[PDB]
């Protein structure tokens, strides 16, 4: 589990609208909320 | 008519989630918004 | 085709509540999203 790939919902040029974008983070960078869900 | 106990529906995290917390405010601190509804 | 009058809503006194409001903007101040849609 050196690197984890996943995405999140983030704001766009229009504040009301939102987009889904993928990013890569190291395993130790994030922590598990609990399955398959994490936060910084 | 001096102390008012109640809770306000506010969110800290989990954007699509709502959780209440109870706090006590003085009567003059909060003004009526309209019955049983107040505002800072 | 020089000044556009139109409606929208944004923040208000209370975060939860909403209010529809109207304002007049110049044609070159805003740009279309595409029909009958614009943004600053």
């Amino acid at each position: 589990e050196e690197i984890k790939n996943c995405s999140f919902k983030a704001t766009t040029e229009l504040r009301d609208k939102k987009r889904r974008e993928y990013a890569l983070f190291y395993r130790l960078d994030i922590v598990p909320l609990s399955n398959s869900e994490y936060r910084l | 008519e001096e102390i008012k106990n109640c809770s306000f529906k506010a969110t800290t995290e989990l954007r699509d989630k709502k959780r209440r917390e109870y706090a006590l405010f003085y009567r003059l601190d909060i003004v009526p918004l309209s019955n049983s509804e107040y505002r800072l | 085709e020089e000044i556009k009058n139109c409606s929208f809503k944004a923040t208000t006194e209370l975060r939860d509540k909403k209010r529809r409001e109207y304002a007049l903007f110049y044609r070159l101040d805003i740009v279309p999203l595409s029909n009958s849609e614009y943004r600053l």
Partner: antibody
Amino acid sequence: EVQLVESGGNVVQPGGSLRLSCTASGFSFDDSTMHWVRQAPGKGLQWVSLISWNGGRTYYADSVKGRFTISRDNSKNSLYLQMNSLKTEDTAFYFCAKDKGDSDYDYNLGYSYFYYMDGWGKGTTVTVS
Amino acid sequence: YVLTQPPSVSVAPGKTARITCGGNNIANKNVHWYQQKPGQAPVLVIYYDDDRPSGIPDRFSGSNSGNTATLTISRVEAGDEADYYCQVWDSNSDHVVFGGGTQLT
């Protein structure tokens, strides 16, 4: 006190089209989002479609995203949901329900829209073939 | 994302009903219960798991914590002989899912 009325249902055939009219009054559509669900006999509720005041947040359910479109207008305050390419397992009573449209705004996170039906209509009818 | 409501429940008059709206990590999502009577459209009875709308019988409360979302009823009466449904909004999966209901005696 609000009322929702729907009409236009009748016998239908697979591969055909039907026009459904759903007028309502008592609450302005300017700040109201309308939902759509169906209630087949012996089964639970199923989400059909969602629509916002003008556009965006018009998300559709996974199983009914094929060629289904929902449109809204402010001139006469009504809604439509035209049935197209009817299957042989999508027959049920379609229900349109009002939504409160509550929201919330944090400078960092942004607008967050909550969804939960408040008012419900009488109900429509569908009969494949 | 799906719910795991019980298939049926039996509560004789004078007892309390413990209807549950099962769901994985449902404590992180709000649950709204509905009454689905036969012959007329459903009416919302609970929203945000604590609030309560107007024009409703009193003593209608619900609890939502852990892995189970439970609805509380008291002095059960034959007028409520219908099916209960719970609604939850999901953004990660990007769809709304309703449970299969639970038959009542």
